[PDB]
Amino acid sequence: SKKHTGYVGLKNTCYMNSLLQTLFFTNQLRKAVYMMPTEGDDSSKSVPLALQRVFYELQHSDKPVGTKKLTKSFGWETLDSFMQHDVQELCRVLLDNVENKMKGTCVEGTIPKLFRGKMVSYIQCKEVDYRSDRREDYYDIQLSIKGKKNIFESFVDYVAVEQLDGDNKYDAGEHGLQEAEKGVKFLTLPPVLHLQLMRFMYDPQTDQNIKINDRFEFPEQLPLDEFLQKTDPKDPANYILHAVLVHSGDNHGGHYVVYLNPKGDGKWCKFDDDVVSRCTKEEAIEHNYGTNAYMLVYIRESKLSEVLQAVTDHDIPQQLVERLQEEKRIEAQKR
Ligand SMILES: O=C([C@H]1Cc2cc(Cl)cc(-c3ccnc4cc([C@@](O)(CO)CCl)sc34)c2O1)N1CCNCC1
Ligand SMILES: [Zn+2]
């Protein structure tokens, strides 16, 4: 309900309602979503326009906001379509559509501005002079949590140098089968940091994946300078916790909640589909360790004013407002 919390819920679609709120309260994205030139797009088919509708209605409605038009636009209507994919794949499906629509426009490069970081995957031979680098972009990170107490330990394990010895030695081609060091190194961390946590793993004796219900800790403030190669004293890599996406119950079904800190000000709310309610820091952060938190969103402190900048009704263009109201006037009177 809007009167208690300030915010409205979504109506049921497993992990989408959790992600849509998370992307909506990324205010700099929301503004750019409104500036997409969707006037010459079809209503039923356009994913850009459907996300504009949800964002419009989440900003403006007092009642809960529908997602049926958005599901129909990218074809994930049934339950089995949601089950096959993960949250990062859904996030990639939404944000790629938004990025491609924003190309050749005033708000181009907004997705990579907010979400795209850079890393180097490297292989160094120990006893011969051969190094092999690849610069990769990333929009999300998938962190390991099995045998890891916290995020710091998971980032250590992410960047940990694997040795290649004995059986598994590096094929250097001309130099031959060589002993070597494999690792990954973060070059930059983006303003909005989507961190998924590896709650599933492969168990050999059952021929099937199984859930990890272990206690995993994550802080409100997250320093990550030690995980970057070349730090910046003018811009430290200190990250404020923004959202926590949570699962409960069994796998084939269950319940899907997101906790959120929409202004970056420690004032937490639980978004349980249609019922949005206030909650403590401890219900959002501490109590969702081990029920399992599966994705976390961190915003960079230096970029927090820009990322969570104030949206107004003036930031939605007139043609889009006129379009979405003309739908709602026709959609009401139909009986
Ligand atoms: O079992 C489920 C249900 C029950 C359940 C429990 C838990 Cl604790 C998390 C998820 C979940 C939902 C969305 N995205 C993700 C991503 C995950 C990763 O671990 C692997 O990509 C991140 Cl590294 S877990 C997860 C979940 O979904 N499935 C079958 C497989 N796809 C989703 C639906
Ligand atoms: Zn993402």
JSON list of C-alpha atoms in Angstrom, two decimals, residues 38-257:
[
{"chain": "A", "resi": 38, "resn": "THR", "atom": "CA", "xyz": [8.61, 4.25, -28.07]},
{"chain": "A", "resi": 39, "resn": "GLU", "atom": "CA", "xyz": [5.91, 6.34, -29.90]},
{"chain": "A", "resi": 40, "resn": "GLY", "atom": "CA", "xyz": [6.26, 4.25, -33.12]},
{"chain": "A", "resi": 41, "resn": "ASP", "atom": "CA", "xyz": [6.23, 0.86, -31.33]},
{"chain": "A", "resi": 42, "resn": "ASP", "atom": "CA", "xyz": [3.46, -1.77, -30.98]},
{"chain": "A", "resi": 43, "resn": "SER", "atom": "CA", "xyz": [1.72, -1.97, -27.57]},
{"chain": "A", "resi": 44, "resn": "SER", "atom": "CA", "xyz": [1.51, -5.78, -27.25]},
{"chain": "A", "resi": 45, "resn": "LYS", "atom": "CA", "xyz": [5.01, -6.60, -28.67]},
{"chain": "A", "resi": 46, "resn": "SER", "atom": "CA", "xyz": [7.44, -3.85, -27.47]},
{"chain": "A", "resi": 47, "resn": "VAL", "atom": "CA", "xyz": [9.45, -4.79, -24.33]},
{"chain": "A", "resi": 48, "resn": "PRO", "atom": "CA", "xyz": [10.72, -1.13, -23.98]},
{"chain": "A", "resi": 49, "resn": "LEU", "atom": "CA", "xyz": [7.11, 0.19, -23.87]},
{"chain": "A", "resi": 50, "resn": "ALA", "atom": "CA", "xyz": [5.96, -2.55, -21.44]},
{"chain": "A", "resi": 51, "resn": "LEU", "atom": "CA", "xyz": [8.75, -1.67, -18.98]},
{"chain": "A", "resi": 52, "resn": "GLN", "atom": "CA", "xyz": [7.82, 2.04, -19.41]},
{"chain": "A", "resi": 53, "resn": "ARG", "atom": "CA", "xyz": [4.20, 1.09, -18.49]},
{"chain": "A", "resi": 54, "resn": "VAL", "atom": "CA", "xyz": [5.22, -0.84, -15.34]},
{"chain": "A", "resi": 55, "resn": "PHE", "atom": "CA", "xyz": [7.59, 2.00, -14.29]},
{"chain": "A", "resi": 56, "resn": "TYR", "atom": "CA", "xyz": [4.90, 4.63, -15.02]},
{"chain": "A", "resi": 57, "resn": "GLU", "atom": "CA", "xyz": [2.29, 2.69, -13.04]},
{"chain": "A", "resi": 58, "resn": "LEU", "atom": "CA", "xyz": [4.73, 1.89, -10.17]},
{"chain": "A", "resi": 59, "resn": "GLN", "atom": "CA", "xyz": [5.50, 5.65, -9.94]},
{"chain": "A", "resi": 60, "resn": "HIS", "atom": "CA", "xyz": [1.82, 6.81, -10.19]},
{"chain": "A", "resi": 61, "resn": "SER", "atom": "CA", "xyz": [-0.70, 4.09, -9.11]},
{"chain": "A", "resi": 62, "resn": "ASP", "atom": "CA", "xyz": [-2.12, 3.70, -5.57]},
{"chain": "A", "resi": 63, "resn": "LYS", "atom": "CA", "xyz": [-3.36, 0.15, -6.35]},
{"chain": "A", "resi": 64, "resn": "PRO", "atom": "CA", "xyz": [-0.97, -2.77, -7.32]},
{"chain": "A", "resi": 65, "resn": "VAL", "atom": "CA", "xyz": [0.58, -2.75, -10.81]},
{"chain": "A", "resi": 66, "resn": "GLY", "atom": "CA", "xyz": [0.04, -5.40, -13.51]},
{"chain": "A", "resi": 67, "resn": "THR", "atom": "CA", "xyz": [2.78, -7.37, -15.31]},
{"chain": "A", "resi": 68, "resn": "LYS", "atom": "CA", "xyz": [0.72, -9.33, -17.96]},
{"chain": "A", "resi": 69, "resn": "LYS", "atom": "CA", "xyz": [1.60, -7.01, -20.88]},
{"chain": "A", "resi": 70, "resn": "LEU", "atom": "CA", "xyz": [5.32, -7.24, -19.93]},
{"chain": "A", "resi": 71, "resn": "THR", "atom": "CA", "xyz": [5.34, -11.08, -19.83]},
{"chain": "A", "resi": 72, "resn": "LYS", "atom": "CA", "xyz": [3.61, -11.24, -23.25]},
{"chain": "A", "resi": 73, "resn": "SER", "atom": "CA", "xyz": [6.19, -8.87, -24.87]},
{"chain": "A", "resi": 74, "resn": "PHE", "atom": "CA", "xyz": [9.25, -11.23, -24.43]},
{"chain": "A", "resi": 75, "resn": "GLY", "atom": "CA", "xyz": [7.25, -14.52, -24.53]},
{"chain": "A", "resi": 76, "resn": "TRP", "atom": "CA", "xyz": [7.86, -15.83, -20.96]},
{"chain": "A", "resi": 77, "resn": "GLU", "atom": "CA", "xyz": [4.14, -16.31, -20.17]},
{"chain": "A", "resi": 78, "resn": "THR", "atom": "CA", "xyz": [4.07, -19.82, -18.60]},
{"chain": "A", "resi": 79, "resn": "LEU", "atom": "CA", "xyz": [5.67, -20.93, -15.29]},
{"chain": "A", "resi": 80, "resn": "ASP", "atom": "CA", "xyz": [8.16, -23.36, -16.95]},
{"chain": "A", "resi": 81, "resn": "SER", "atom": "CA", "xyz": [9.70, -20.46, -18.99]},
{"chain": "A", "resi": 82, "resn": "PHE", "atom": "CA", "xyz": [10.58, -18.62, -15.72]},
{"chain": "A", "resi": 83, "resn": "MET", "atom": "CA", "xyz": [11.86, -21.85, -14.08]},
{"chain": "A", "resi": 84, "resn": "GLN", "atom": "CA", "xyz": [14.36, -22.74, -16.88]},
{"chain": "A", "resi": 85, "resn": "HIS", "atom": "CA", "xyz": [16.15, -19.34, -16.69]},
{"chain": "A", "resi": 86, "resn": "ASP", "atom": "CA", "xyz": [17.75, -17.54, -13.69]},
{"chain": "A", "resi": 87, "resn": "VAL", "atom": "CA", "xyz": [17.46, -13.92, -12.40]},
{"chain": "A", "resi": 88, "resn": "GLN", "atom": "CA", "xyz": [20.67, -12.74, -14.18]},
{"chain": "A", "resi": 89, "resn": "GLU", "atom": "CA", "xyz": [19.34, -14.13, -17.49]},
{"chain": "A", "resi": 90, "resn": "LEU", "atom": "CA", "xyz": [16.03, -12.23, -16.99]},
{"chain": "A", "resi": 91, "resn": "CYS", "atom": "CA", "xyz": [18.05, -9.11, -16.07]},
{"chain": "A", "resi": 92, "resn": "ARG", "atom": "CA", "xyz": [20.08, -9.60, -19.29]},
{"chain": "A", "resi": 93, "resn": "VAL", "atom": "CA", "xyz": [16.84, -10.03, -21.38]},
{"chain": "A", "resi": 94, "resn": "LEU", "atom": "CA", "xyz": [15.31, -6.78, -20.00]},
{"chain": "A", "resi": 95, "resn": "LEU", "atom": "CA", "xyz": [18.45, -4.59, -20.04]},
{"chain": "A", "resi": 96, "resn": "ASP", "atom": "CA", "xyz": [19.58, -5.67, -23.58]},
{"chain": "A", "resi": 97, "resn": "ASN", "atom": "CA", "xyz": [16.16, -4.61, -25.00]},
{"chain": "A", "resi": 98, "resn": "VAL", "atom": "CA", "xyz": [16.40, -1.28, -23.13]},
{"chain": "A", "resi": 99, "resn": "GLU", "atom": "CA", "xyz": [20.05, -0.74, -24.27]},
{"chain": "A", "resi": 100, "resn": "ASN", "atom": "CA", "xyz": [19.35, -1.50, -27.98]},
{"chain": "A", "resi": 101, "resn": "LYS", "atom": "CA", "xyz": [16.29, 0.83, -27.93]},
{"chain": "A", "resi": 102, "resn": "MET", "atom": "CA", "xyz": [18.42, 3.59, -26.32]},
{"chain": "A", "resi": 103, "resn": "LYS", "atom": "CA", "xyz": [21.03, 3.39, -29.16]},
{"chain": "A", "resi": 104, "resn": "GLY", "atom": "CA", "xyz": [21.06, 6.43, -31.46]},
{"chain": "A", "resi": 105, "resn": "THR", "atom": "CA", "xyz": [19.30, 8.51, -28.73]},
{"chain": "A", "resi": 106, "resn": "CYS", "atom": "CA", "xyz": [20.12, 11.15, -26.08]},
{"chain": "A", "resi": 107, "resn": "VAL", "atom": "CA", "xyz": [20.12, 8.45, -23.33]},
{"chain": "A", "resi": 108, "resn": "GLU", "atom": "CA", "xyz": [22.49, 5.98, -25.11]},
{"chain": "A", "resi": 109, "resn": "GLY", "atom": "CA", "xyz": [25.01, 4.04, -23.02]},
{"chain": "A", "resi": 110, "resn": "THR", "atom": "CA", "xyz": [22.94, 4.25, -19.79]},
{"chain": "A", "resi": 111, "resn": "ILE", "atom": "CA", "xyz": [22.97, 0.45, -19.14]},
{"chain": "A", "resi": 112, "resn": "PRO", "atom": "CA", "xyz": [26.80, 0.19, -19.45]},
{"chain": "A", "resi": 113, "resn": "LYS", "atom": "CA", "xyz": [27.18, 3.48, -17.48]},
{"chain": "A", "resi": 114, "resn": "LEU", "atom": "CA", "xyz": [25.32, 1.94, -14.51]},
{"chain": "A", "resi": 115, "resn": "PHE", "atom": "CA", "xyz": [25.98, -1.82, -14.83]},
{"chain": "A", "resi": 116, "resn": "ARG", "atom": "CA", "xyz": [29.07, -2.64, -17.01]},
{"chain": "A", "resi": 117, "resn": "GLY", "atom": "CA", "xyz": [32.39, -3.25, -15.22]},
{"chain": "A", "resi": 118, "resn": "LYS", "atom": "CA", "xyz": [35.65, -4.71, -16.60]},
{"chain": "A", "resi": 119, "resn": "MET", "atom": "CA", "xyz": [37.98, -7.62, -15.68]},
{"chain": "A", "resi": 120, "resn": "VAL", "atom": "CA", "xyz": [41.07, -9.46, -16.98]},
{"chain": "A", "resi": 121, "resn": "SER", "atom": "CA", "xyz": [41.14, -13.27, -17.08]},
{"chain": "A", "resi": 122, "resn": "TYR", "atom": "CA", "xyz": [44.85, -14.17, -17.26]},
{"chain": "A", "resi": 123, "resn": "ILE", "atom": "CA", "xyz": [47.08, -17.27, -17.63]},
{"chain": "A", "resi": 124, "resn": "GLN", "atom": "CA", "xyz": [50.79, -16.81, -16.69]},
{"chain": "A", "resi": 125, "resn": "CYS", "atom": "CA", "xyz": [53.31, -19.64, -17.22]},
{"chain": "A", "resi": 126, "resn": "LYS", "atom": "CA", "xyz": [55.72, -19.97, -14.25]},
{"chain": "A", "resi": 127, "resn": "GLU", "atom": "CA", "xyz": [58.95, -21.29, -15.87]},
{"chain": "A", "resi": 128, "resn": "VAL", "atom": "CA", "xyz": [58.63, -19.86, -19.48]},
{"chain": "A", "resi": 129, "resn": "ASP", "atom": "CA", "xyz": [57.89, -16.29, -20.69]},
{"chain": "A", "resi": 130, "resn": "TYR", "atom": "CA", "xyz": [54.30, -16.63, -21.96]},
{"chain": "A", "resi": 131, "resn": "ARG", "atom": "CA", "xyz": [51.25, -14.65, -20.73]},
{"chain": "A", "resi": 132, "resn": "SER", "atom": "CA", "xyz": [47.69, -14.75, -22.16]},
{"chain": "A", "resi": 133, "resn": "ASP", "atom": "CA", "xyz": [45.13, -12.03, -21.26]},
{"chain": "A", "resi": 134, "resn": "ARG", "atom": "CA", "xyz": [41.47, -11.41, -22.16]},
{"chain": "A", "resi": 135, "resn": "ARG", "atom": "CA", "xyz": [39.70, -8.15, -21.23]},
{"chain": "A", "resi": 136, "resn": "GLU", "atom": "CA", "xyz": [36.04, -9.10, -20.51]},
{"chain": "A", "resi": 137, "resn": "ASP", "atom": "CA", "xyz": [33.03, -6.89, -19.76]},
{"chain": "A", "resi": 138, "resn": "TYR", "atom": "CA", "xyz": [30.50, -8.00, -17.12]},
{"chain": "A", "resi": 139, "resn": "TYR", "atom": "CA", "xyz": [27.00, -6.71, -16.18]},
{"chain": "A", "resi": 140, "resn": "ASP", "atom": "CA", "xyz": [26.52, -9.09, -13.18]},
{"chain": "A", "resi": 141, "resn": "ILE", "atom": "CA", "xyz": [28.76, -11.23, -10.90]},
{"chain": "A", "resi": 142, "resn": "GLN", "atom": "CA", "xyz": [28.00, -14.80, -9.69]},
{"chain": "A", "resi": 143, "resn": "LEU", "atom": "CA", "xyz": [29.73, -15.32, -6.31]},
{"chain": "A", "resi": 144, "resn": "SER", "atom": "CA", "xyz": [30.44, -18.71, -4.68]},
{"chain": "A", "resi": 145, "resn": "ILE", "atom": "CA", "xyz": [29.05, -19.17, -1.12]},
{"chain": "A", "resi": 146, "resn": "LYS", "atom": "CA", "xyz": [29.75, -22.87, -0.22]},
{"chain": "A", "resi": 147, "resn": "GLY", "atom": "CA", "xyz": [32.32, -22.85, 2.60]},
{"chain": "A", "resi": 148, "resn": "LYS", "atom": "CA", "xyz": [32.35, -19.01, 2.49]},
{"chain": "A", "resi": 149, "resn": "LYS", "atom": "CA", "xyz": [31.34, -17.04, 5.63]},
{"chain": "A", "resi": 150, "resn": "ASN", "atom": "CA", "xyz": [30.85, -13.66, 3.86]},
{"chain": "A", "resi": 151, "resn": "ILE", "atom": "CA", "xyz": [31.10, -11.48, 0.66]},
{"chain": "A", "resi": 152, "resn": "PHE", "atom": "CA", "xyz": [34.77, -10.60, 1.42]},
{"chain": "A", "resi": 153, "resn": "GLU", "atom": "CA", "xyz": [35.64, -14.34, 1.45]},
{"chain": "A", "resi": 154, "resn": "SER", "atom": "CA", "xyz": [33.64, -14.87, -1.80]},
{"chain": "A", "resi": 155, "resn": "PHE", "atom": "CA", "xyz": [35.50, -11.99, -3.55]},
{"chain": "A", "resi": 156, "resn": "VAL", "atom": "CA", "xyz": [38.81, -13.50, -2.30]},
{"chain": "A", "resi": 157, "resn": "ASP", "atom": "CA", "xyz": [37.76, -16.87, -3.81]},
{"chain": "A", "resi": 158, "resn": "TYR", "atom": "CA", "xyz": [36.63, -15.10, -7.04]},
{"chain": "A", "resi": 159, "resn": "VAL", "atom": "CA", "xyz": [40.11, -13.55, -7.56]},
{"chain": "A", "resi": 160, "resn": "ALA", "atom": "CA", "xyz": [42.09, -16.53, -6.07]},
{"chain": "A", "resi": 161, "resn": "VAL", "atom": "CA", "xyz": [45.02, -17.80, -8.17]},
{"chain": "A", "resi": 162, "resn": "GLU", "atom": "CA", "xyz": [44.44, -21.40, -9.29]},
{"chain": "A", "resi": 163, "resn": "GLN", "atom": "CA", "xyz": [47.62, -23.46, -9.88]},
{"chain": "A", "resi": 164, "resn": "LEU", "atom": "CA", "xyz": [47.95, -25.69, -12.96]},
{"chain": "A", "resi": 165, "resn": "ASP", "atom": "CA", "xyz": [50.29, -28.62, -12.06]},
{"chain": "A", "resi": 166, "resn": "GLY", "atom": "CA", "xyz": [50.86, -32.35, -12.64]},
{"chain": "A", "resi": 167, "resn": "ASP", "atom": "CA", "xyz": [47.76, -33.68, -14.43]},
{"chain": "A", "resi": 168, "resn": "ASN", "atom": "CA", "xyz": [46.13, -30.33, -15.29]},
{"chain": "A", "resi": 169, "resn": "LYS", "atom": "CA", "xyz": [49.12, -28.40, -16.72]},
{"chain": "A", "resi": 170, "resn": "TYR", "atom": "CA", "xyz": [48.61, -25.52, -19.22]},
{"chain": "A", "resi": 171, "resn": "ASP", "atom": "CA", "xyz": [48.90, -26.41, -22.94]},
{"chain": "A", "resi": 172, "resn": "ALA", "atom": "CA", "xyz": [51.18, -23.59, -24.22]},
{"chain": "A", "resi": 173, "resn": "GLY", "atom": "CA", "xyz": [51.25, -25.01, -27.81]},
{"chain": "A", "resi": 174, "resn": "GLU", "atom": "CA", "xyz": [54.77, -24.28, -29.09]},
{"chain": "A", "resi": 175, "resn": "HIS", "atom": "CA", "xyz": [56.30, -24.10, -25.57]},
{"chain": "A", "resi": 176, "resn": "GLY", "atom": "CA", "xyz": [54.37, -27.33, -24.67]},
{"chain": "A", "resi": 177, "resn": "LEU", "atom": "CA", "xyz": [52.66, -28.63, -21.51]},
{"chain": "A", "resi": 178, "resn": "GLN", "atom": "CA", "xyz": [53.72, -25.96, -18.97]},
{"chain": "A", "resi": 179, "resn": "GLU", "atom": "CA", "xyz": [53.10, -25.29, -15.26]},
{"chain": "A", "resi": 180, "resn": "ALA", "atom": "CA", "xyz": [51.06, -22.07, -14.89]},
{"chain": "A", "resi": 181, "resn": "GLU", "atom": "CA", "xyz": [48.89, -19.75, -12.76]},
{"chain": "A", "resi": 182, "resn": "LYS", "atom": "CA", "xyz": [45.25, -19.07, -13.77]},
{"chain": "A", "resi": 183, "resn": "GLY", "atom": "CA", "xyz": [43.29, -16.18, -12.21]},
{"chain": "A", "resi": 184, "resn": "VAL", "atom": "CA", "xyz": [40.86, -13.26, -12.68]},
{"chain": "A", "resi": 185, "resn": "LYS", "atom": "CA", "xyz": [41.43, -9.58, -11.76]},
{"chain": "A", "resi": 186, "resn": "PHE", "atom": "CA", "xyz": [38.83, -6.75, -11.51]},
{"chain": "A", "resi": 187, "resn": "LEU", "atom": "CA", "xyz": [39.84, -3.60, -13.46]},
{"chain": "A", "resi": 188, "resn": "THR", "atom": "CA", "xyz": [36.75, -1.55, -12.55]},
{"chain": "A", "resi": 189, "resn": "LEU", "atom": "CA", "xyz": [33.55, -2.02, -10.50]},
{"chain": "A", "resi": 190, "resn": "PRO", "atom": "CA", "xyz": [30.38, -0.35, -11.93]},
{"chain": "A", "resi": 191, "resn": "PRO", "atom": "CA", "xyz": [28.04, 2.16, -10.11]},
{"chain": "A", "resi": 192, "resn": "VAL", "atom": "CA", "xyz": [25.23, -0.42, -9.69]},
{"chain": "A", "resi": 193, "resn": "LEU", "atom": "CA", "xyz": [26.71, -3.80, -8.68]},
{"chain": "A", "resi": 194, "resn": "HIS", "atom": "CA", "xyz": [24.43, -6.84, -9.23]},
{"chain": "A", "resi": 195, "resn": "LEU", "atom": "CA", "xyz": [25.84, -9.74, -7.16]},
{"chain": "A", "resi": 196, "resn": "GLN", "atom": "CA", "xyz": [24.14, -13.15, -7.46]},
{"chain": "A", "resi": 197, "resn": "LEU", "atom": "CA", "xyz": [25.02, -15.82, -4.87]},
{"chain": "A", "resi": 198, "resn": "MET", "atom": "CA", "xyz": [25.54, -19.46, -5.94]},
{"chain": "A", "resi": 199, "resn": "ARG", "atom": "CA", "xyz": [22.72, -21.20, -4.03]},
{"chain": "A", "resi": 200, "resn": "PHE", "atom": "CA", "xyz": [22.77, -24.31, -6.36]},
{"chain": "A", "resi": 201, "resn": "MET", "atom": "CA", "xyz": [25.59, -26.84, -7.13]},
{"chain": "A", "resi": 202, "resn": "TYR", "atom": "CA", "xyz": [26.12, -30.21, -8.90]},
{"chain": "A", "resi": 203, "resn": "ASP", "atom": "CA", "xyz": [25.99, -33.34, -6.66]},
{"chain": "A", "resi": 204, "resn": "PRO", "atom": "CA", "xyz": [27.45, -36.39, -8.52]},
{"chain": "A", "resi": 205, "resn": "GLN", "atom": "CA", "xyz": [25.59, -39.29, -6.78]},
{"chain": "A", "resi": 206, "resn": "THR", "atom": "CA", "xyz": [22.08, -37.84, -7.54]},
{"chain": "A", "resi": 207, "resn": "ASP", "atom": "CA", "xyz": [22.57, -36.65, -11.20]},
{"chain": "A", "resi": 208, "resn": "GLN", "atom": "CA", "xyz": [20.72, -33.42, -10.21]},
{"chain": "A", "resi": 209, "resn": "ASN", "atom": "CA", "xyz": [21.28, -29.95, -8.66]},
{"chain": "A", "resi": 210, "resn": "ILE", "atom": "CA", "xyz": [20.53, -29.29, -4.95]},
{"chain": "A", "resi": 211, "resn": "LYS", "atom": "CA", "xyz": [20.01, -26.11, -2.90]},
{"chain": "A", "resi": 212, "resn": "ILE", "atom": "CA", "xyz": [22.53, -24.61, -0.43]},
{"chain": "A", "resi": 213, "resn": "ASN", "atom": "CA", "xyz": [20.80, -23.37, 2.79]},
{"chain": "A", "resi": 214, "resn": "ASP", "atom": "CA", "xyz": [24.08, -22.20, 4.47]},
{"chain": "A", "resi": 215, "resn": "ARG", "atom": "CA", "xyz": [24.46, -18.97, 6.46]},
{"chain": "A", "resi": 216, "resn": "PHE", "atom": "CA", "xyz": [26.05, -16.31, 4.24]},
{"chain": "A", "resi": 217, "resn": "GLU", "atom": "CA", "xyz": [26.78, -12.81, 5.61]},
{"chain": "A", "resi": 218, "resn": "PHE", "atom": "CA", "xyz": [26.81, -9.50, 3.67]},
{"chain": "A", "resi": 219, "resn": "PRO", "atom": "CA", "xyz": [27.41, -5.96, 5.07]},
{"chain": "A", "resi": 220, "resn": "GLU", "atom": "CA", "xyz": [25.60, -2.62, 4.68]},
{"chain": "A", "resi": 221, "resn": "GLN", "atom": "CA", "xyz": [28.88, -0.96, 3.61]},
{"chain": "A", "resi": 222, "resn": "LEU", "atom": "CA", "xyz": [31.14, -3.02, 1.30]},
{"chain": "A", "resi": 223, "resn": "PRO", "atom": "CA", "xyz": [34.75, -1.84, 0.60]},
{"chain": "A", "resi": 224, "resn": "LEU", "atom": "CA", "xyz": [36.31, -3.49, -2.52]},
{"chain": "A", "resi": 225, "resn": "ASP", "atom": "CA", "xyz": [39.59, -1.53, -3.25]},
{"chain": "A", "resi": 226, "resn": "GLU", "atom": "CA", "xyz": [41.77, -4.55, -2.34]},
{"chain": "A", "resi": 227, "resn": "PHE", "atom": "CA", "xyz": [39.99, -6.55, -5.13]},
{"chain": "A", "resi": 228, "resn": "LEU", "atom": "CA", "xyz": [40.81, -3.87, -7.78]},
{"chain": "A", "resi": 229, "resn": "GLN", "atom": "CA", "xyz": [44.30, -3.76, -9.35]},
{"chain": "A", "resi": 230, "resn": "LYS", "atom": "CA", "xyz": [44.82, 0.03, -9.56]},
{"chain": "A", "resi": 231, "resn": "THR", "atom": "CA", "xyz": [42.81, 1.93, -6.91]},
{"chain": "A", "resi": 232, "resn": "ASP", "atom": "CA", "xyz": [41.71, 5.58, -7.02]},
{"chain": "A", "resi": 233, "resn": "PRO", "atom": "CA", "xyz": [42.07, 7.77, -3.85]},
{"chain": "A", "resi": 234, "resn": "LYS", "atom": "CA", "xyz": [39.67, 10.38, -5.36]},
{"chain": "A", "resi": 235, "resn": "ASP", "atom": "CA", "xyz": [37.02, 7.62, -5.90]},
{"chain": "A", "resi": 236, "resn": "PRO", "atom": "CA", "xyz": [37.17, 4.66, -3.43]},
{"chain": "A", "resi": 237, "resn": "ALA", "atom": "CA", "xyz": [35.22, 1.45, -4.21]},
{"chain": "A", "resi": 238, "resn": "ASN", "atom": "CA", "xyz": [32.89, 1.69, -1.19]},
{"chain": "A", "resi": 239, "resn": "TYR", "atom": "CA", "xyz": [29.45, 0.21, -1.85]},
{"chain": "A", "resi": 240, "resn": "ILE", "atom": "CA", "xyz": [26.17, 0.80, 0.04]},
{"chain": "A", "resi": 241, "resn": "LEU", "atom": "CA", "xyz": [23.67, -2.10, 0.16]},
{"chain": "A", "resi": 242, "resn": "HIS", "atom": "CA", "xyz": [20.53, -1.25, -1.87]},
{"chain": "A", "resi": 243, "resn": "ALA", "atom": "CA", "xyz": [18.46, -4.43, -2.40]},
{"chain": "A", "resi": 244, "resn": "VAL", "atom": "CA", "xyz": [18.29, -8.05, -1.16]},
{"chain": "A", "resi": 245, "resn": "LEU", "atom": "CA", "xyz": [16.27, -10.58, -3.23]},
{"chain": "A", "resi": 246, "resn": "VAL", "atom": "CA", "xyz": [15.10, -13.55, -1.08]},
{"chain": "A", "resi": 247, "resn": "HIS", "atom": "CA", "xyz": [13.55, -17.01, -1.65]},
{"chain": "A", "resi": 248, "resn": "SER", "atom": "CA", "xyz": [11.52, -19.20, 0.77]},
{"chain": "A", "resi": 249, "resn": "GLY", "atom": "CA", "xyz": [9.89, -22.67, 0.66]},
{"chain": "A", "resi": 250, "resn": "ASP", "atom": "CA", "xyz": [10.58, -25.53, -1.79]},
{"chain": "A", "resi": 251, "resn": "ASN", "atom": "CA", "xyz": [12.13, -25.13, -5.28]},
{"chain": "A", "resi": 252, "resn": "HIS", "atom": "CA", "xyz": [9.26, -26.15, -7.61]},
{"chain": "A", "resi": 253, "resn": "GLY", "atom": "CA", "xyz": [7.07, -23.29, -6.29]},
{"chain": "A", "resi": 254, "resn": "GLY", "atom": "CA", "xyz": [7.95, -21.30, -3.13]},
{"chain": "A", "resi": 255, "resn": "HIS", "atom": "CA", "xyz": [7.65, -17.59, -2.25]},
{"chain": "A", "resi": 256, "resn": "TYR", "atom": "CA", "xyz": [9.61, -14.62, -3.68]},
{"chain": "A", "resi": 257, "resn": "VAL", "atom": "CA", "xyz": [10.34, -11.40, -1.69]}
]
